[PDB]
Amino acid sequence: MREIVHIQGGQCGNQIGAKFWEVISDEHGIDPTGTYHGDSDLQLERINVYYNEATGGRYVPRAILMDLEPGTMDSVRAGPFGQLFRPDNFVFGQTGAGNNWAKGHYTEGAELIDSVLDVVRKEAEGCDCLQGFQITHSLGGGTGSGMGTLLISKVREEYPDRIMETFSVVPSPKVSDTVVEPYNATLSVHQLVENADECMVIDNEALYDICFRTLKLTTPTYGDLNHLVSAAMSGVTCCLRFPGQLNSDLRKLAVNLIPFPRLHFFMIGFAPLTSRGSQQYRALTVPELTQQMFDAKNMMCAADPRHGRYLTASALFRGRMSTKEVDEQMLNVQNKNSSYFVEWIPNNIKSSICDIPPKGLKMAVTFVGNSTAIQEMFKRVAEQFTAMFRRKAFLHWYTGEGMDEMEFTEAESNMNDLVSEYQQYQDATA
Amino acid sequence: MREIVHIQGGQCGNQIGAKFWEVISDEHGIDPTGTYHGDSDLQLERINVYYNEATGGRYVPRAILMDLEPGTMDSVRAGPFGQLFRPDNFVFGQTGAGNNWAKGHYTEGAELIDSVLDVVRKEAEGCDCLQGFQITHSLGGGTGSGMGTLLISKVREEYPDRIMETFSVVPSPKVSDTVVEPYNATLSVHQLVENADECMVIDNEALYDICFRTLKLTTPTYGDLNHLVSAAMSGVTCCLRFPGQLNSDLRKLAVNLIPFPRLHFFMIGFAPLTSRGSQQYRALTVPELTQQMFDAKNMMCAADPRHGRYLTASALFRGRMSTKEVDEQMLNVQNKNSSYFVEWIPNNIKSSICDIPPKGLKMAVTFVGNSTAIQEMFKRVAEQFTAMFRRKAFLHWYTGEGMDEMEFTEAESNMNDLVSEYQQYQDATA
Amino acid sequence: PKLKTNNNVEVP
Amino acid sequence: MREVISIHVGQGGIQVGNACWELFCLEHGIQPDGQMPDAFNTFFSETGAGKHVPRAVFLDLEPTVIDEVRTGTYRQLFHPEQLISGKEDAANNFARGHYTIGKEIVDLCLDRIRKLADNCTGLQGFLVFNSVGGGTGSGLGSLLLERLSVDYGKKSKLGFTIYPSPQVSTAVVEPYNSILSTHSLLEHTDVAVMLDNEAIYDICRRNLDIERPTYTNLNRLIAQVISSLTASLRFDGALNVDITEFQTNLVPYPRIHFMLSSYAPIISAEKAYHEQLSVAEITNSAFEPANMMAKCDPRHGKYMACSMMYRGDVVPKDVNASIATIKTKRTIQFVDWCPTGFKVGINYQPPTVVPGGDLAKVMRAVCMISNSTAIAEVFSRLDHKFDLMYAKRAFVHWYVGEGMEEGEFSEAREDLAALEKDYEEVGIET
């Protein structure tokens, strides 16, 4: 019951899913052949959340994979746990977008999306009670940031009451791999605010910083960043698949973390994270988890959370632990940092406890906090956008496929209005 | 009791029968030597439906094979299960028709048909209680589309109360193998509506599409198309040869699927169909069967069923299953698609259950639906006919054998009237 | 569903 | 011939119901299977031969807790179809569980209530348990109370609500639904008992010497209080008290029925037997402000009436000799218009111990239910918390979009202001 379907688009989203599904399968004891080989009874009670049942007793994820080029899905199939995905759900084009947002949203993405919407509708109509959808995509690419966001609007138009999740990677100015990143980032943020019920920003720069400083491993690769993102993704829905002292589905988090409908851009972090050589030194206790959870360097975004004030915060503890300690520590982390918490909403931290810890760990915490410090990312994105747009650089590529500069002006104005009205509440006082 | 005889004409019909009889013999455990070697008692109880009994304990089909050239029947005899056919039933001419409808219906087909009608009369007068006849022929050929349709009228004139089936392959404009296809298609459709109690259209283009997309086999051949058509043919009369929860002979389907006597052109489809590599992934359940049964690509015709509204529908489930699930799923497939079902006739889906599944499969479904979307085939056939006829192209071949243009004009007018009055009920409202 | 306008008025 | 029905709604309600139902089964000698290996009739019913069925119903929209109940050791005890469960959680939204999803479930609960009530012949009243700071709990409790108040009328209903702590909180939006639920049960419930978690945490820490308590330890103390309250109905005693004999002794006026409880002694077996546990010292400990079961200071207000229950081998003369000492003390002062304010009950059955629990076995215990003027502080602080966020209309869109009107928040505020004015008006001397 109350299950969700997985939809991913683009190369970055496909690579994120290729590790997210591996993590989920390892958590539920599903072999790469789709056969259950788990140890505990609880591993099968709520498997309908992510997995479907077919004849022969094997399980198949309800994931939908889409891209405008076939290479990435032809590569993910040969990887581990690549056989679980149903071949029918693979939809792809023969041309690609070339990191051009217009091509992936107006000319090419519009004709292809009917086939993927057909299978999306097939998956949603069938399921017992829908909880919602979760979306993984990147804002630094053309086909992803175009087709995914248009699909968001199409899904929202047909299921207005369901919940919608988006895990979005925004292009940081530090590690830049594409010159046309500001254009399709700014165009995508315009559409994303209007339809997504929840959005979670993730930055490659913050992932590299975490890998270099906390884990202290010499050579980070995309596999480590994907593993961290996958652990963070799994931590959110853990209590929906396992029993606990205070169950809290996604809708309950939506109620408690979004004060106003347009303020739904969160930054997350996962604890504990320790190096291989120091994993024996540390002792896992609730104070040790909560001190690392609110650490500024532990956030999955380069945004500095002590440059603003938290509107609200959430924590999803895992493992068996006493609730009194959790509540007193949450109170203590809020009394010692009163300057960084907005004062006109008292008791702005939500807590939840799940009795099933991750495989290999005795305690774990997932942190989701809505803070005013996120304005800095939109500020720098808009700064680069307006630095590049004033000369009409690279504009002809977009304008040759039916798009105009008016949609750029409206997007810039709406993004600046969002930036302004997000900080409006930072200076608000009672 | 209530048995039927088999009559086939032309090369296409002979090739269809050469696989239909193989499928029937394999279902009833009859060796290619006519000796029973089956396992179950039920395999022999109702064998009188299709097979006759002769001395020595062997069985012989009551099939009649006719063609205007001897090559195809001289070739089908050397194939597997070719010895079952009685040599006396083979009737053929020495000239052929050359894909000319006039030659196969006026000059050559008229003189030969007396001999085949003699054996047809011998077969029908003898049998215990006649149920009816089933006819397999192609509308793209001359001798078939002429002699078969004239034989339809001759049989109808002598047995007005019996039921008549016709499985007709109409020439699609996509895969065209004969230039004079529109003429003998249009001439044949004129006569076919007046006499056939049931008609089932089959298209080679739809068979290729199914083989390429659902089964995903690399190199389709006529053997695969024949096998699919044979499975669909066998599925219709299964409950007449085996016990079941709700037996339903052909006459019961005739009552429930034909609202008005001139609307008897159905399109069919068979489920399940899965690729070799995915036959282990899937689990056979009633929802899985019914979702594939109403799939648009699964129809044996290129006609798109979501371009019109179903007047009525029928399903013939096979295997042992609960009736409550079947009824609730039929209700669900009709509540979620109310836009594609005509509203002035409520509860327009018929269901039947047979406890004997096909050999090798645990569940199977045969779908027969009367829909308004079939108008598109007659529209394109008439379009090609009127494009070719306005210049009197290839007309001299037909007019040199006693035929005139008046019979072409009447045929075109009657076909257009059929097209119009078939869609008349699509816009009808209560 | 109702939309909140910038003046806190809920309009259907 | 005396019966009572207990209603459990929400996660906290179900988790405290489990806690009370181990204790009752243990106290009446009934095994977890429901089989005994005439006092049971108050809580149970005889099935004719063998097992006993509790007179309780479990409600929740989120299925996890009920599924945990239906698989534990107590799966055989409860009737299978009185554990009403939903599919979608209210997610801390009060408007959801009062207007959207609770209405479709409330009819089944009312049918179950009728089916349980027709069995009872001497129905004393109803008990209800619900954690106030949640969507489904508060909303469904409000709706059930409103339906019962008109279906049955004058039957007495008792509410063991758990209000949020002064500063410790798990959610961020719980003041809104707490205020709304207080509005709803102010005019609909005959008795409401305060149960916030912080006071009980302090009790456990100070007396039980547990530094890491969980919810089970809290629920066991609540279960002991319930057992002490209802002991007089099912055991012989020198001075009996019935449920209907409360509004005549503790409720001076129809509006004022919120009171706070205390229990004594609370002590572990490691140091319990070193001291004599006389009646005087336990009745002194029960009146200590630090042993209040709700985090309120009785020194800040007057007393109105005290109803306090004893059980064990206590003698009435020792009780009178201790009531005199309390009347003597200068730190405890009663209201002017109440010369005597004590109602005393004495029972013979000593409290029962649960194996593996915290409390030890003792021969004397005291449970007090005291109505005092100091309770207005919790209302004032909840009102202050509510006003801070209602000034900017935060989180209101999550409630307006679930069918609730804009003005519904204001009238709850007006009723709280009226209640606070009434509490001030009553406490002034003449």
Add this chain to the structure above:
Amino acid sequence: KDHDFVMSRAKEIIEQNSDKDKQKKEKELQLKKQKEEEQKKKADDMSSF
């Protein structure tokens, strides 16, 4: 302070571009669209008729 000035100015700039574009585009678009629609309808109806 300059950030704010630029954002306001950019917003203004957006408005300026939009205004010029909008007026020219609107006039041209309306005339052309009307003509095209009429012609297609026109010829198709006559031949069909």
